[PDB]
Design a protein around this ligand. Structure first.
Ligand SMILES: *[C@@H]1O[C@H](CO)[C@@H](O[C@@H]2O[C@H](CO)[C@@H](O[C@@H]3O[C@H](CO[C@H]4O[C@H](CO)[C@@H](O)[C@H](O[C@H]5O[C@H](CO)[C@@H](O)[C@H](O)[C@@H]5O[C@H]5O[C@H](CO)[C@@H](O)[C@H](O)[C@@H]5O)[C@@H]4O)[C@@H](O)[C@H](O[C@H]4O[C@H](CO)[C@@H](O)[C@H](O)[C@@H]4O[C@H]4O[C@H](CO)[C@@H](O)[C@H](O)[C@@H]4O)[C@@H]3O)[C@H](O)[C@H]2NC(C)=O)[C@H](O)[C@H]1NC(C)=O
Ligand code: XJU
Ligand code: CA
Ligand code: NA
Ligand code: NA
Ligand code: ZN
Length: 806
């Protein structure tokens, strides 16, 4: 119940929300059908429209008008945004030359530059260039401020997950808004685009920017706008709030536009109908900037122009139907569209089986336009698994396509031509970032970055301490003129042991064999130097990774590679080696095919054994440092040490051997040498974070050798490829991957073919940031470079996407 008989007199767009049944006058009362009876008359005035005209100038104030052109309107803070232009001979902001804002220029009583977030739904990144001729105000923000060529949204590339990511810095699996539609099995409740469940605070986790601000004594405008409040009124309300007295005035504000998404869905991303909504957004920016100029705030306020996701061409004829795959289609519930999520239709149906569903959806039709995954097998870069609202079975849908359950869903719910939601590396999903203001840099282009980084920067812009989030604070300091956040590198928690030769060959009973008993003061001192680390500077180029948790491990040196060997997990946490452009690939010699060699530095009790592999019929082994890239026949024996061995399913060894035998050398060729750090990942609870020992669900049969869920590699070179990776004076270049360690190659439908036709494609799908690897391993990389620390943070957040040009 709302007793709508109260009044909005002097309450229009009030910032405090009054509680039921008292009637509301805030910018959301419409969405709750709770506004006071006179809210439209008083708060949504439209008379005479939104623009001053010559004959209105100096008019007698008429309080009924939507906005004013009377002499008192500046002091009342309610002029039409074009008032000084029409009536006082001023220029529109867009018409003024851009001039650097070196310091804030704020009216007295302003304690800090306010922040205004101008949020545009479905604003595809390439609109900034492709629509530039019809967006002069936005083009001026972009060219005169700080801009990225695109900003990467989070997956799924849907509105609710992305806006709530922008406000919290959190992945949707963490904040809990994992789609536009959701079922929470603990609540037994459904969240929908339409209806009243979505306003229940229990859905929304983390701490959004307006809560962070309020807790720290920084007042906030309301961030949400009812769809029926016209955009001109939204702008006027913000400008009115900015004329509040100092003690009452917010420091952070948000505007929202439902366009261009609304039209993009109807017309496609580049339909001829799309020019007009771009013109209209630009005009609204122009209103804001003109309004700020009138208040003498246009060189005081920081403005962020930001989108949530892009828009792709999708039509209802490009829909895949589960009813062409599944016998039991009526036994499942599908969340459909540009992603699929499947769960049992009834929890009382004991004939539901996710394995038979996955199998029936796997590589069934030659051109099939979606791929099924258990959520733990999705690319780790999507960070889309650790939430009970994310169904176990996921369909990744190809760009331009939909998935639906049955054809009747699509015609008896087709006119739509655009949609979004796909993989967040897809070019059509990328969106926009521009920042303009005293705190942002001047005429500066920054590389693309992820929207999970923005909350930290928004906190910086406002002097707030951010709540714990998934950004890497400092990774965007290069966007900022001032207020940068200068972090210190985390302290190493575990120091390594440096074991020398401690065990005789006969102390080992590992069941391994090697034909190496084939036999010099020249060469012997040399090989002792290698075991003491004399080649370490060439293979460990950026310092040893720091271990940020408590464990026991050994540094092992070799001619060709250095490793940090875990006594707890019986294998390296990391293996680091450098391959120059001149390196030669060689075979594993016939007599060495099955060679594994005890490591006389490491006790038998902390070693793997070969018998466990012989006896585990499902599990084989591979090596982290590749025997194919040994520097000499003699150095090659080091690659067969038991301390360089890792457990690998035979199907996985196909991928790994092709990476090591072919792809490493290709990258060294293309990049002028590469440094590679490889290792295992254990993430059996799919939380994106390093497992402890007691979370490991699988061991090599009969043994304490834990099976990795993934293997990573970090592949670093000189950004200026005219210098070789090992003599790089400047910024670095990196690509990394986190490959799932799976017992089949069912993910790759072309896997019966030669590895040259599918392996690299798999690796590209599983591209990752170095930061993703850090979370998964508790290691901290790039500890010793000549680069600034924030530069390194940027490098660690880089994702190599392999998409063509935006
Ligand atoms: C991205 O950034 C985020 C933010 O930094 C990272 O997320 C954090 O990760 C931490 C570790 O996983 C985690 O810390 C835990 O906090 C628990 C207390 O939980 C509440 O309090 C916090 C703080 O206010 C709050 O934010 C939480 O919010 C979660 O849950 C609510 C309601 O369910 C949601 O609305 C909200 O969206 C959020 O859900 C997300 O996180 C939870 C995990 O908490 C997931 O379950 C969800 O699916 C979703 O992703 C909570 O309201 C605390 O209880 C934990 O402590 C346990 O473990 C430690 C080990 O150190 C130990 O001290 C205790 O023994 C304890 O164990 C006991 O409970 C076990 C489980 O029942 C049981 O098995 C044992 O036997 C014990 O009884 C833990 O310290 C922190 O909560 C989140 N924060 C957020 C916002 O997500 C994220 O990791 C980053 N991602 C990457 C990849 O880097
Ligand atoms: C009832 N009416 C609406 O909700 C309209 N609406 C759309 C919407 C839909 C789902 C989730 C959030 C929002 C928020 C959107 N506001 C904005 O984007 C302005 C900036 C902003 C605000 C909030 C958040 Cl969480 C993040 C950001 Cl960057 C807004 O007002
Ligand atoms: Ca884990
Ligand atoms: Na085996
Ligand atoms: Na296959
Ligand atoms: Zn949309």
């Amino acid at each position: 119940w709302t007793a709508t008989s109260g009044s909005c007199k002097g309450r229009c767009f009030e910032l405090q929300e009054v509680g039921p049944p008292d009637c509301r006058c805030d910018n959301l009362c419409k969405s709750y059908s709770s506004c006071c009876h006179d809210f439209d008359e008083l708060c949504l005035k439209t008379a005479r429209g939104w623009e001053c005209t010559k004959d209105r100038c100096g008019e007698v104030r008429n309080e009924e008008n939507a906005c004013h052109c009377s002499e008192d309107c500046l002091s009342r803070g309610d002029c039409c945004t074009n008032y000084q232009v029409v009536c006082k001979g001023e220029s529109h902001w867009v018409d003024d030359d851009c001039e650097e804002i070196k310091v804030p220029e704020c009216p007295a009583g302003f304690v800090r530059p306010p922040l205004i977030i101008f949020s545009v739904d479905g604003f595809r990144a390439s609109y900034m260039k492709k629509g530039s001729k019809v967006m002069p105000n936005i083009e001026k923000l972009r060219s005169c401020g700080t801009h990225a060529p695109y900003m990467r949204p989070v997956y799924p590339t849907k509105t609710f997950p992305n806006l709530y990511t922008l406000a919290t810095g959190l992945y949707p699996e963490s904040h809990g808004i994992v789609g536009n539609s959701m079922y929470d099995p603990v609540f037994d409740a459904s969240f929908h685009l339409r209806g009243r469940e979505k306003f229940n605070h229990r859905w929304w986790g983390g701490q959004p920017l307006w809560i962070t601000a309020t807790k720290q004594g920084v007042r906030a405008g309301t961030f949400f706008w009812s769809v029926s409040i016209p955009h001109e009124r939204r702008i006027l309300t913000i400008l009115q709030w900015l004329s509040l007295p100092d003690n009452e005035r917010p420091s952070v504000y948000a505007f929202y536009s439902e366009q261009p998404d609304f039209s993009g869905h109807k017309y496609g991303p580049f339909g001829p109908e799309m020019t007009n909504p771009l013109r209209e957004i630009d005009k609204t920016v122009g209103q804001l900037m003109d309004g700020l100029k009138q208040l003498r705030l246009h060189r005081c306020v920081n403005v962020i122009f930001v989108g949530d996701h892009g828009m792709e061409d999708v039509t209802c004829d490009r829909t895949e139907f589960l009813s062409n795959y599944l016998t039991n289609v009526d036994d499942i519930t599908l969340v459909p569209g540009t992603l699929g999520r499947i769960r049992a239709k009834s929890i009382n149906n004991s004939k539901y089986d996710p394995k038979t569903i996955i199998a029936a959806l796997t590589c069934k039709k030659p051109d099939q336009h979606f791929k099924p995954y258990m959520k733990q097998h999705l690319p780790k870069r999507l960070h889309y698994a650790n939430n009970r609202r994310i169904e176990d079975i996921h369909l990744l849908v190809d760009r331009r396509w939909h998935v639906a359950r049955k054809p009747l869903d699509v015609y008896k719910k087709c006119f739509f031509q655009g949609d979004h939601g796909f993989d967040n590396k897809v070019n059509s999903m990328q969106t926009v970032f521009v920042g303009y203001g005293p705190t942002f840099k001047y005429r500066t282009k920054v590389p693309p970055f992820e929207n999970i980084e923005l909350y930290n920067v928004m906190c910086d812009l406002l002097g707030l301490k951010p709540a714990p989030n998934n950004g890497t604070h400092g990774s965007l300091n290069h966007l900022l003129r001032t207020n940068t956040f200068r972090p210190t590198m985390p302290d190493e928690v575990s120091r390594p042991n440096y074991p020398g030769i401690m065990y005789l060959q006969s102390e080992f009973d590992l069941g391994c064999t090697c034909d190496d008993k084939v036999e010099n003061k020249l060469e012997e001192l040399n090989k002792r130097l290698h075991t003491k680390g004399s080649t370490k500077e060439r293979h460990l180029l950026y310092g040893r990774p720091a271990v940020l948790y408590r464990t026991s491990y050994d540094i092992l040196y070799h001619t060709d590679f250095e490793s940090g060997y875990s006594e707890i997990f019986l294998m390296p946490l990391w293996t680091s080696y450098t391959i120059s452009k001149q390196a030669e690939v060689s075979s594993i010699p016939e007599h060495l095919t099955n060679c594994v060699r005890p490591d006389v530095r490491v006790s038998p009790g902390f070693s793997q054994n070969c018998l466990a592999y012989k006896n585990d019929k499902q599990m084989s082994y591979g090596f982290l440092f590749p025997p194919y890239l040994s520097s000499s026949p003699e150095a090659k024996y080091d690659a067969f040490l038991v301390t360089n061995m890792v457990p690998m399913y035979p199907a996985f060894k196909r991928v790994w051997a092709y990476f090591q035998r072919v792809l490493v050398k290709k990258y060294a060729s293309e990049r002028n040498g590469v440094n590679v750090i490889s290792g295992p990942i254990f993430d059996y609870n799919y939380d994106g974070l390093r497992d402890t020992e007691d979370e490991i669900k699988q061991y090599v049969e009969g043994s304490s050798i834990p099976v990795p869920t993934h293997y990573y590699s970090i592949i670093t070179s000189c950004l200026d490829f005219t210098q070789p990776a090992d003599k790089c004076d400047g910024p670095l270049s990196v690509s990394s991957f986190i490959l799932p360690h799976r017992p089949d190659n069912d993910e790759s439908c072309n896997s019966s073919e030669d590895e040259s036709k599918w392996v690299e494609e798999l690796m590209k799908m599983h591209t990752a940031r170095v930061r993703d690897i850090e979370h998964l391993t508790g290691l901290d990389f790039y500890r010793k470079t000549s680069r600034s620390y924030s530069e390194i943070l940027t490098l660690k957040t880089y994702l190599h996407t392999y998409e063509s040009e935006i």
